[PDB]
């Protein structure tokens, strides 16, 4: 997901502006749905919701717009258990042997004959939560097992939290409402309001451990890999209690990152650190936020956002609709140089021509260079020490960058990676002259619709995830609900689309209507005022009661 909030010091109108570009599934239980809710006099909010949840998840109201992105904070901890040496169904806490609890569930299964059979399954539980097995990584042997404590299991506040967000007046009010309830499970929140405040909050439900406990309570091997893991044989490694927290064992709101600015804040699923590099967010718990290299989507956004020039709505829209493959900025110049160094090598000719002709985009009309580039990058990612300039913590916006072609072993390995990538592209069924929109599609009944965008891992802000199906790449997730909100005197002006359309049902008139618009990148008014709604020539009305 991406989010950008712009404040009074950078917006062209001196008021707030918000771009919401969540990247979510195109099917299933997390498929966004647009709606506008009004209880006259006390609630008036519009945006998109998730299936079965009668609240707006990402949206706007008269003076405020907000959105969410998945955060990098931990919302659970694994606990490594030390098992009783006499009994692997018992585990030790402070040297004392405790029994695991067993909870059995029974499931009905429809068989080959069409009849139901009952299957019983035992779930083992510790004082921390259920045991989990990841074969070859988190085993249950005679020495150790792993349990998982999920902080959101006790978060009964999630629905109330979004109903409260839906009632929020401005950025200050939104912050109060979120910090007071602490009901957000696993996302960042970014917002802008009419007065021109831009807000970022990493305000979610995060297991709390006092800082002095971390060095001894962490499992060093697992934390090194980004897995939140604690020593489950020591009672002192229980989540810490703080009376200021809304829920026993979670981090108080005062200890979680917040940035309130008048220029901008942004997030593309990296940590709080470089939300705005002019004011880095540092000094938080490793469970909360760490100073890690940022992804190419955030690097792209920061490249467009930094400086002093005003930002117009159109600029933010074009950050999405450009389909710029930002990862190409890091390697394509050196890749083209390698290509020129190897003129006359038959294994590289088609690839090098395709790469040279390529618009560095993931547009419908983008050439096969994008496909060659993707297959190359998947292989480049597996190479050791091939960056010309590796990650530099002092230059996090501009590193890593370039290919170390001056190193003979790297030049050899990079050339082999490109030859291997080319061989893979040429093996697959791609008709010569075919473009990106010919390959990446969303199926709608018996038909297909070409879809622009590409994987977020390649630095495409308009992130689209696809999977091979038959002759095509089928879109499964990414850009979903888009809203771009500004605040002119008359009322909030919002523009966007729901990429996959309102209905998942092929019979519906709203199964592919916005998907056709998304293909053509033609965003639309999101009508909010009675005047806007009444101006719509498609307006229909129904009143219902029982």
């Amino acid at each position: 997901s991406n989010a950008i909030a712009v404040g009074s010091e950078r917006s062209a109108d001196g008021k707030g502006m918000l771009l919401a570009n969540p990247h979510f599934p195109w099917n299933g239980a997390m498929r966004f749905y647009q709606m506008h809710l009004t209880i006259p006099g006390r609630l008036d909010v519009m945006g998109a919701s998730l299936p079965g949840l009668p609240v707006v998840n990402i949206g706007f109201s008269r003076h405020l717009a907000w959105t969410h992105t998945v955060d990098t904070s931990s919302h659970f901890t694994l606990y490594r258990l030390a098992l009783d040496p006499k009994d692997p169904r018992r585990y030790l806490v402070d040297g004392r042997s405790l029994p695991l609890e067993e909870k059995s569930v029974a499931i009905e299964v429809r068989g080959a004959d069409g009849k139901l059979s009952r299957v019983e399954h035992k779930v083992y539980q510790s004082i921390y939560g259920p045991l989990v097995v990841w074969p070859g990584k988190l085993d249950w042997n005679r020495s150790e097992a792993y349990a998982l404590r999920d902080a959101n299991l006790e978060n009964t506040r999630v629905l109330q939290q979004w109903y409260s967000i839906n009632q929020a007046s401005d950025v200050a009010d939104l912050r109060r409402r979120v910090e007071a309830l602490q009901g957000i499970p696993w996302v960042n929140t970014l917002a802008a309001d009419e007065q021109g405040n831009a807000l970022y909050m990493n305000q979610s439900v995060v297991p709390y451990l006092k800082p002095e406990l971390i060095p001894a309570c962490a499992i060093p091997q697992l934390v090194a890999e980004g897995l939140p893991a604690l020593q489950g044989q020591d009672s002192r490694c229980a989540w810490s209690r703080d009376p200021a927290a809304a829920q026993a064992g979670i981090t108080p709101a005062a200890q979680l990152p917040v940035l309130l600015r008048r220029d901008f804040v942004q997030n593309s699923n990296d940590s709080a650190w470089l939300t705005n590099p002019a004011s880095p967010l540092q000094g938080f718990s490793p469970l909360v936020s760490q100073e890690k290299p940022i992804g190419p989507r955030a690097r792209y956004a920061l490249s467009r956002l930094q400086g002093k020039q005003p930002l117009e709505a159109k600029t933010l829209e074009e950050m999405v609709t450009a389909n710029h493959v930002f990862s190409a900025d890091q390697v394509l110049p050196d890749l083209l140089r390698l290509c020129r160094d190897n003129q006359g090598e038959k294994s590289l000719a088609r690839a090098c021509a395709a790469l040279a002709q390529w618009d560095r985009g993931a547009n419908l009309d983008s050439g096969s260079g994008f496909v060659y580039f993707q297959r190359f990058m998947q292989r480049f990612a597996e190479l050791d020490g091939a960056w010309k300039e590796p990650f530099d913590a002092q230059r996090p916006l501009d590193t890593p960058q370039g290919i170390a072609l001056d190193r003979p072993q790297v030049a050899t390995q990079v050339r082999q990676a490109l030859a291997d990538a080319a061989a893979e592209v040429e093996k697959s069924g791609i008709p010569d002259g075919a473009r990106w929109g010919d390959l990446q599609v969303s199926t709608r009944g018996q038909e297909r619709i070409a879809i622009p965008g590409g994987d977020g891992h390649f630095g495409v802000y308009n992130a689209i995830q696809s999977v091979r199906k038959g002759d095509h790449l089928e879109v499964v997730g990414g850009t979903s609900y888009i809203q771009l909100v500004t605040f002119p005197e008359e009322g909030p002006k919002a523009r966007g689309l729901l990429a996959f359309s309102q209905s998942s049902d092929p019979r519906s008139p709203h199964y592919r209507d916005q998907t056709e618009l998304f293909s053509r990148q033609q965003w639309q008014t999101l009508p909010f005022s009675d005047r806007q709604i009444d101006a719509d020539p498609q307006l229909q009305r129904l009143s219902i009661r029982e």
């Binding site: 299936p51 079965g52 009905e108 259920p130 989990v132 959101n152 009964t156 629905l159 008139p509 009143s543």
Partner: protein
Amino acid sequence: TGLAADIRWTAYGVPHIRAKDERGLGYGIGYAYARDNACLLAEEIVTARGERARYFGSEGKSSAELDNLPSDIFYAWLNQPEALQAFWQAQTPAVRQLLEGYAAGFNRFLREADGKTTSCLGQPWLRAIATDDLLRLTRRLLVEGGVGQFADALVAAAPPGAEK
């Protein structure tokens, strides 16, 4: 009863729900949503109830690409009656009203549906819903950042035997 809503739709089927209270608001939301997505919600509720294998057998998967039987064990464990009851008891009156309205509005659409916008008409799993079903969906979302990412791992957790 005491459930009423006014719904307007603008271009592309976007509903605008007006009501005097949360129960009526939920009524309008559930009805509008069902018109577009009844089959989707019924399928996802089957998943969150741990009933996939009952309707579809063990060969299929959920929309999260988990096998039906492991998915059912996970959701049966997650959404035990005691857990749903405790979750409900912790909800504010406004939230309870939104959920009661939503279930009633979704069910109103189902009573009237003739297949115009509902491809799964006549399937045994397309059934009236309960507020508990909405809590099952809510809890399924809650754990997407935690134990839900370990659903297969939870199902696989069994103690060692006599092996060397």
